[PDB]
Amino acid sequence: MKYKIPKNFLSGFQILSQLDKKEIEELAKLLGELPVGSNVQEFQSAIQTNKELSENALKSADTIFSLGGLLLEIKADDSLNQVAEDLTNAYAKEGEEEIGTEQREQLIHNLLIVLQKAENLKKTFKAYRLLFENTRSFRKSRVMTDMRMIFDDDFQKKNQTGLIIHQLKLEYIEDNTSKEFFISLDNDDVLKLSEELKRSLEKEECIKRDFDQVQFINIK
Amino acid sequence: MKYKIPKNFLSGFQILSQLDKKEIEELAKLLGELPVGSNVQEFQSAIQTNKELSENALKSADTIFSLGGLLLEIKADDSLNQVAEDLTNAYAKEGEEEIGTEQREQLIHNLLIVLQKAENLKKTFKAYRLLFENTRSFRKSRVMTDMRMIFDDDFQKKNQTGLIIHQLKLEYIEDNTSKEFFISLDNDDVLKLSEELKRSLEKEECIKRDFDQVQFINIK
Amino acid sequence: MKYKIPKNFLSGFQILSQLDKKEIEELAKLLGELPVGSNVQEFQSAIQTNKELSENALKSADTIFSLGGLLLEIKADDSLNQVAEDLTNAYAKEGEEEIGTEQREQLIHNLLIVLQKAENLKKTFKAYRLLFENTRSFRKSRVMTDMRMIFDDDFQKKNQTGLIIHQLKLEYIEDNTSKEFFISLDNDDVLKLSEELKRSLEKEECIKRDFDQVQFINIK
Amino acid sequence: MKYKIPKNFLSGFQILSQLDKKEIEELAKLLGELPVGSNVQEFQSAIQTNKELSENALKSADTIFSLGGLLLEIKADDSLNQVAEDLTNAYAKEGEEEIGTEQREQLIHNLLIVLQKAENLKKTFKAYRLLFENTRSFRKSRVMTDMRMIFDDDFQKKNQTGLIIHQLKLEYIEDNTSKEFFISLDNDDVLKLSEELKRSLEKEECIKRDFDQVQFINIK
Amino acid sequence: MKYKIPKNFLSGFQILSQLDKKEIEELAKLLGELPVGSNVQEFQSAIQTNKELSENALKSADTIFSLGGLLLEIKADDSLNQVAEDLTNAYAKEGEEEIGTEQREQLIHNLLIVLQKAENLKKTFKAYRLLFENTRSFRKSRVMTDMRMIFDDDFQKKNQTGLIIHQLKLEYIEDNTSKEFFISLDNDDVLKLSEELKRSLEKEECIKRDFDQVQFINIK
């Protein structure tokens, strides 16, 4: 079929098919005003705080935000109108209802209205797509350090000496698989790494500064 | 045999067997004055700068420093005198010369003189031994970062946007085997890691401060 | 050929072939007086301290002691005379000399004289054979213990608490391959193990006591 | 959600949400009086023997003791108040009831009261956490020994001789997986190991003695 | 080339090329009188005891016996004359000498004389070939049995009871690879196996008896 439709989005598809023309047009306007990099939580909170929006939009907001992952899975080589028609067929086949012709056309028209524009969201999910062409990425880390004292073969001598060691442990996702990695350190190397990363941070700040003509974004 | 004698230390063993009584006693005194954690390079440089020492000591200094790795490979359960005798036999069997009885006894006596004392050096190599009961340890790392701009399907629109990414690569030894590991980062996580490691550094400083009654050393 | 002859035993075979009749007969007598479980070092030391024995016996003593490993590799189903003849052929083919007929017969006769009797030595090496039908056995072990103190998140509180841990490491041979194994313990389990092994030791002593009619040996 | 809530603790969560203010405050006091290293069985028995405590506390005692494993899974970087709120939400979502606002606030307040303090319990579970950063640990062992007699090829000779062997078998957990290991011994090595472990025990006693200023605990 | 010529048979090939016409004809006669199943040792001993045969035949007897393994490696589809010519070329190329034309023709003629006939030897090596189309075959075995007594937890009771066990170990060749296999038995199963193998032996004797019109051979 046209799309690998999740079975949970079917209610959102029904809401969008039955949604009012005013609501879809206003949502399209707001999406066209959406800045790049906005996340799902902020979008849904803004929808909630918008009084003119019924709960239908918020209940379908996740589906709307999910469009960015399929807005680029589709390509300019195809006609958005035919994409809307085929996806309406896919939803009527695998979704909640075999939509009647009038609501089928309403859903297709709403798809065309909303799937159009969608520029900043599509670019955001492209940045995310360009982001993870790689193999792996961090998620978190934890630092652990221990100290241990030095003893004698015969304890007729009191313990005067010890040793301090350091450990780091990190977490990351590789090829859609979560992972972690464990290492032990000494303070001097930690300081050296701090110097390296501080130098790279200054580089990054200078890069912020270099192209005042262009914007550079953090995407989460 | 008593020891897995390196074939390069044979000249050092010959020098020690023929070494003067004054030189061995003075070297034993200096070693008994050696602070814990002193490395081979510093010891050899100090030997060189000491005028009373002939080149024999410096040429055997590496062997002297190598004793710490076998000073603990031996154990208090054995008699140092018999250890010296057996190692003299091992050297006379696998080493340069089948030592004559007089020089055999001279070598054994010199071993007893110098292998005795050797407290701080033995404790240093114990710290190194207690150090690497683990599996792996760092050696170095390198930070790499890249930036990339965002484009349009049709370049009727000028490029206004881009994305900045960061990469770290690290090197380490595991189970006597050198290794490396590669990861990509974002600035926020780098800052968070900096905060973590700075907190741990403050912890380490407070640990420096906590036990004024005991010393804690960095060993290299 | 008859035996997988070591190339170092060839000198011992030559000595035995040329050895005096008095010496071989006396050695056969002494071997027939040998108690079970005697090791090579004790046998060679006794040979050295025996004045009537020339250095030929001591230089061939290791070969004599090596017979126990091949005294059972052979079996009663074969004639010791033909075994001696075939092994003389094997030595003359792979060994030092193509023995002349007179010394060939002398060697065969000496083999028959000495390979005969050899009761306690053969039984000792059978015990060793019955010993290692298994897979693995110990060789040594080492006990290691460490202690570590408990700290606070904020060191406004002084450290009042710590923890003590124990470690054991062991060495063993499996299937002719040396091995080791590492574990960490607590004092209570160490005490419990001490109780178990003490109970088993009392069992072993009672077993010493139970069969006064039979002897039980430790073989090394 | 906030926590990987076990589905059996839901009743304990309900009890805690509906629990009396006097009971939660008294339990918080008792927990603040709890010494480090106390185990679940002793805590529950003490709760049972305490007359002022209803069966609600004992039925939720296991959940209370389970907090130590999640008291450190959380970290000081987060606000305990928000932790309580989020975990109340998690319980109301995955647990028994969609708690009403009044009992929701009661549960959050009770969490704040009891999750606070909890110093010795948290330190105990930290010691357990610091305990098992390793790979494996014992659980038990069993000692087995056998004896076997020596025979002749022809039994015209009566059996006068035998051999005694010893076996040890041990059990341990590695990486959350139970394991065992099997070895055979001789009495001499058993005695040698006894000597080693006794020496280490004397070391441990001297370590007990060395730091009178600090306490060291056994945790089970 | 025609054959994977062993480099040790080259002397035998030279002897055969230079061998007398009378000797080759007599050897061909004797081989045509050879019964099936005769082994190399018996053939060589008979050659030695035959006075009319020079040492040339015995020194080439092993090569003659080796022909059976290549007498069937060749096939009736090829002309024995051309086989002799090609193998003479192979020997002159890889062997001792680039044979002169006269001795080349002599060798080819001798090959034709002797490689002809060779009926019983060829059939014997065919039986050996038909023998080892399988995967594996025995070579030897050894039987081992042990007995062990039953003890009490407290030896206030004297040992009245024991247990007897049996072991068998076997050796075999599989796919040109030597192998062994180990098992433990009880007396009853040994008796049952004895009964089975005795029944099969009676079957084999009846099979000896059944076809008086045909002969059946043991080949070694």
Added chain:
Amino acid sequence: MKYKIPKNFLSGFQILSQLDKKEIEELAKLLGELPVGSNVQEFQSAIQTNKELSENALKSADTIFSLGGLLLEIKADDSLNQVAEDLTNAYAKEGEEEIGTEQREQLIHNLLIVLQKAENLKKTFKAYRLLFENTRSFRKSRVMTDMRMIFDDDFQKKNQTGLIIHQLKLEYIEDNTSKEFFISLDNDDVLKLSEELKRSLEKEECIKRDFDQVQFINIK
């Protein structure tokens, strides 16, 4: 719980709990008269042929015979009284009925009466336990032999010759897993193996004879 109670033994446990005092005492007497090595079938048949025994004993006879496998799974270090109490609790928790206090005490008392004594049965199952510390054991075997005739490339010659081969196939259990093994033989090796096993059988008979002071049993 105390025991991994089979769910089929629950009826036997109920019968034993409700069983008469006379019956349990008589069964304990009979078990104390039981010789070592008696199997379940013989015990149950004897119970059936005993007129004073009701069907309760036979229906619980299998459970009684199953005690030997758990009579040694328990150990002398534990109190049989507490073992009976804990197993009564285990049965009342996982078994047919939450036994009333009077029948609970009756069951515990019956367990103490019958679980006591049980000397020969416990020793029998110990022999079985000492039996299978190994890896594998036989269960059966089958002997197969075939004969095949020798033919010619051209059948102008009548077939005069053939070959006889032998095969053995065996079955065994390894590590609680059934197994089999297949081999082909020749008559001579079969005869040799017969000689070996007959020699070992004579050894076993001489071992029967050697210790008239002790008994040795076959256990099935």
Added chain:
Amino acid sequence: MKYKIPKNFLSGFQILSQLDKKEIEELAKLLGELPVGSNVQEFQSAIQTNKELSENALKSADTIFSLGGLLLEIKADDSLNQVAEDLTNAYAKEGEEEIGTEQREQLIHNLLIVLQKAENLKKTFKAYRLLFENTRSFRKSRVMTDMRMIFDDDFQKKNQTGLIIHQLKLEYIEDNTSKEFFISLDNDDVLKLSEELKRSLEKEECIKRDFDQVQFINIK
């Protein structure tokens, strides 16, 4: 139990248990008249065409034919009467009905009547058993051939040349697993293989002819 009873044969077992004495005796006679190698389809068709036989026999004919696979799974070492009794017990335990004593005895008697004789069928399934002691066997094959023409780099030259190739593909069962194998051929090798297989066919015909005293069968 006695047999791994298929759950579909239970109806056949019921029919046989209730079958008339005349029918079972007549079927036993017919089976004793059955020639070796008869397949299930022919046997069932003959049963159908036999007017004296009710549909009971045909409905149980498959079970009757299935006996050959278990007629040899049993062995002469066991009593056919006890085999019938035990299999009647197995059917009454795992089959349709807990047979009443009268019909149980009827079934056992019918088994004894019919399981007896059964000579040619048993020998047929033995031939099938002797057949598949091997690893694999054919099931089918398919021949495929293709031809391709030769072209020029520049087609200013007309194509005058081509190449013809051949392919064979085959199917077989190995170790109860179906398999296939694919190869490409040339006409000359196909002709050579035809010659080989024709020669072997002539060999097989001569083998048909050689032993007029014995019969040789094709079994399917």
Added chain:
Amino acid sequence: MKYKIPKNFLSGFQILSQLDKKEIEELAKLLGELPVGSNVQEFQSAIQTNKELSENALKSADTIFSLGGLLLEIKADDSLNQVAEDLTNAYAKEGEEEIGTEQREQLIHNLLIVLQKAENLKKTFKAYRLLFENTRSFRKSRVMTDMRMIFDDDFQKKNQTGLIIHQLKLEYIEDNTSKEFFISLDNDDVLKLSEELKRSLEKEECIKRDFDQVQFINIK
């Protein structure tokens, strides 16, 4: 370098460099008259039988025939003149002689003369190249068949029955690696395969017949 020059072709390259102009031109003519599919042996025999050709051509004939494998390893995209120059350089660098300029030019001119034309040979080696784009191909096979008789459990019955089986074994090269494959057959399947391959042979003959306008070749 230009070509992976074999070190044995160096003499052929020298001969070609020093070869006469008449000889190279005549050889080029003959090669231009060579039909497609001619093999090395036939070409060399024709060269030998040609009186006008010196032994130089035959000694370089193998190199000439080897050109087809490198005549297509080169491609029309390159200039044959520059190919000749570069290969002359390669031969002068890795070959016998650092050719003088005059003989260097002679060799290049001879290469251009002979490497030109070479149409049928190049097409032949292209057919061979187009041949082995696949993975594997036959080399030979062998057919083996056996027969075995059927016996009784008790030989009171004479053997009346037997079974005949068939075996095929084949050899092939895969990915430049020689291989073989073993299977057992029955006469019926052999006949069926004969029918299949005969049908395919008739297909191949009809394919011979179909395109009278084109030729199709067998290449060896």
Added chain:
Amino acid sequence: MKYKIPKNFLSGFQILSQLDKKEIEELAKLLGELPVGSNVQEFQSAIQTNKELSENALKSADTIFSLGGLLLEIKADDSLNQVAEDLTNAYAKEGEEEIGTEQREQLIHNLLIVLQKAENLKKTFKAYRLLFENTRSFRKSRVMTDMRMIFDDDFQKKNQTGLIIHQLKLEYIEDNTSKEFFISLDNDDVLKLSEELKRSLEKEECIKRDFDQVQFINIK
């Protein structure tokens, strides 16, 4: 040592150590005039065509070009003077000569002169370094296509139909390992791929056009 010195560059190092001051200064000037992306062949050809340069420069030109791979293996964190000193030591230790002090200083000074500047070459090898942080890259490919005709089961019908197929094969290096990959295509997909790659080529041209302020290079 400082560098993993190739043993072939030793002559280049000697030449550079003995090289004239004028030559090294002129070469440094020329290198500072070198544009980015220049390859070794062009650099060496330019050196050859430069009359003022002796053959010393060309013979050391490859070493000079090899500096880019080690100019970045070193880093700005180190002093180029000390790098030159350490590499002079490395060459004097592992290279041709233990350089005399005067020529040692000359070599160090020449290294400082030439290793300095080197901007475009270093950036070129950085681009190559930034190039192959990936895993693999192409080297070549080859396109192959075939056509095949459609036939009938019975050739009473003439062949009117066929099928055309296409194949592509490609070569690439992965992780310093050469590789290839094989696929079959149809004309339509080839056309579609042509359209895709043409669109991407237009994109690349527009990218050429977009940043007139910056240069973008092809590096080989």
